[PDB]
From a paper:
eCGP123 is a bright green FP engineered for extreme stability, and was developed using a two-step process. Phanta was isolated by expression screening of a library targeting amino acid positions 62/63/65/69 and 191/192/193 in the bright green fluorescent protein eCGP123. Phanta contains the substitutions Gln62Met, Thr69Val and His193Gln. The protomers in each protein are typical of the [name]-superfamily and consist of an 11-stranded β-barrel (or β-can) with two small helices forming interconnecting loops protecting the chromophore from bulk solvent.
Collectively, these data indicate that in Phanta the substitution His193Gln plays a key role in reducing ΦF, whilst the substitution Thr69Val is required to suppress formation of the protonated chromophore species observed in eCGP123H193Q. The Phanta chromophore has a pKa of 4 which is significantly lower than that for the other proteins (pKa, 6), and is a desirable property that minimises unwanted pH-driven fluctuations when it is used as a pcFRET acceptor. Omit maps show that the electron density corresponding to the imidazolinone moiety of the chromophore in each of the four protomers of Phanta is well defined. In contrast, there is evidence for disorder around the 4-hyroxybenzyl ring in protomers C and D of the Phanta structure, suggesting that it is mobile within the chromophore cavity. Since a rigid chromophore is considered a prerequisite for efficient fluorescence emission, it is possible the increased mobility observed contributes to the low fluorescence efficiency of Phanta (ΦF, 0.003). Accordingly, in the weakly fluorescent Phanta and eCGP123H193Q the planar network is significantly altered, leaving the chromophore without the underlying scaffold present in eCGP123T69V and eCGP123. In Phanta and eCGP123H193Q, Glu215 no longer interacts with the side chain of Gln193 that replaces the histidine at position 193. Instead a hydrogen bond is formed between the Nδ1 of Gln193 and the Oγ of Ser142, which in turn forms a hydrogen bond with Oη of the chromophore. In Phanta the hydrogen bond network around the chromophore extends from the Oη of the 4-hydroxyphenyl ring to the N2 of the imidazolinone ring, and the O2 of the imidazolinone ring via protein matrix hydrogen bonds involving the side chains of Tyr177, Arg91 and Glu144.
Residue numbers in the entry: 3 to 61, 65 to 220
Write the structure that this text describes.
């Protein structure tokens, strides 16, 4: 079902501190390699007045290099697909919630993403566009009350700079019942490869690999 080379088509509808926006994307990834690249275009919301970095993790855990001995909840979820619900709490009270419904047709993945952010201080590094990139991270994957959950302590590097923290909490729900995996970790690095002046056009990349804890 999951082809070694999978295309990506997405649509994100959002609002951050009241600013409404629509972003559309087209890309390709090698799901077994855990690599993917997206070309993102700002369709609505003129020049985005907030850091584009807060959006990047919202733009698919099917794109992870999974060891065989660890059940792959995300790749088994297809063709029907899966959904995810994420909470993103920033250290200065900025709060984001994003939802994504992921479907599949042929060699292509389709995402309907909803992104909502509020309480970002006007002088904070998000509204001030003072963020550089996300630091490489580790998502702790585990089953709590019969659902697959993912936690990640994220850190945005700043101009100067030091770090600006965010806590992610995600719920992964496959549409049809599949094998829930034992506790594992997913290491990732998300990067903006290129962009134009106002981030109207962005080229995004991600490399992700699953593994067990050496404990």
């Amino acid at each position: 079902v999951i082809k070694p080379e999978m295309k990506i088509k997405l649509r994100m509808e959002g609002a951050v501190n009241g600013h409404k926006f629509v972003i559309e994307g087209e890309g390709i990834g090698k799901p077994y390699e855990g690599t993917q690249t997206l070309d993102l275009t700002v369709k609505e919301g003129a020049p985005l007045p907030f850091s584009y970095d807060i959006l990047t993790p919202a733009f698919n855990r099917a794109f992870v290099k999974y060891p065989k001995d660890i059940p792959d909840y995300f790749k088994q979820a297809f063709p029907e697909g899966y959904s995810w619900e994420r909470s993103m709490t920033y250290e200065d009270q900025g709060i984001c919630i994003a939802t994504s419904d992921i479907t599949m047709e042929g060699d292509c993945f389709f995402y309907k993403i909803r992104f909502d952010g509020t309480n970002f201080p006007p002088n904070g590094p998000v509204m001030q566009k003072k963020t550089l990139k996300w630091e490489p991270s580790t998502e702790k994957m585990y089953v709590r009350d019969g659902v697959l959950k993912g936690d990640v302590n994220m850190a945005l590097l700043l101009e100067g700079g030091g770090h600006y923290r965010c806590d992610f909490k995600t719920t992964y729900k496959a549409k049809k019942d599949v094998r829930l995996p034992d506790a594992h970790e997913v290491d990732q690095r998300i990067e903006i490869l290129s962009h134009d002046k106002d981030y109207n056009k962005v080229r995004l990349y991600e490399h992700a690999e699953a593994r067990y804890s050496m404990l």
